[PDB]
Amino acid sequence: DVEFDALLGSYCNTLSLVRFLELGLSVACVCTKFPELAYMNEGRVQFEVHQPLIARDGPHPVEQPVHNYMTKVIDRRALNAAFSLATEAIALLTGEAL
Amino acid sequence: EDTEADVPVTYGEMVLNGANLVTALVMRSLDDVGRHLLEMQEEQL
């Protein structure tokens, strides 16, 4: 008996792709691309910070401009996503048989 | 104060600044070792 049809009114949305850029957190992290990371043994981030200065009068007891070298250590992590296929579909995706 | 904001799209990239200088040759004067370096530097630019 059974007969099928598809309404055009709406569409169910199977799970929706979410970019990470569109979210709020994206602010907190500037994100760049290592073409490779894991090959690194250890790494660091190097940058300079002057110390600000305030001029004063009077016989100058002390001061001199100051730099800093701040270096902080990368932390390697990783994400894992499982995926599976039976042989039922492999032939189809493959091609002709012997 | 507002609803629709702007967001960056493309990720930040990186550039190689400095490297070990390592080359070779198969013996062409003896300066070509030098000239080949500038060659192999001119690539990275």
Partner: peptide
């Protein structure tokens, strides 16, 4: 058929330190 490899000199300098006082972290390489 000999192979020639350029000698490599590795040294690091902090020229700006002379221009100004600095207090760099020990671990980091200036």
């Amino acid at each position: 058929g000999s192979i020639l490899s350029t000698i490599e000199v590795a040294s690091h300098r902090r020229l700006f330190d002379f221009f100004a006082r600095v207090r760099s972290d020990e671990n980091s390489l200036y």
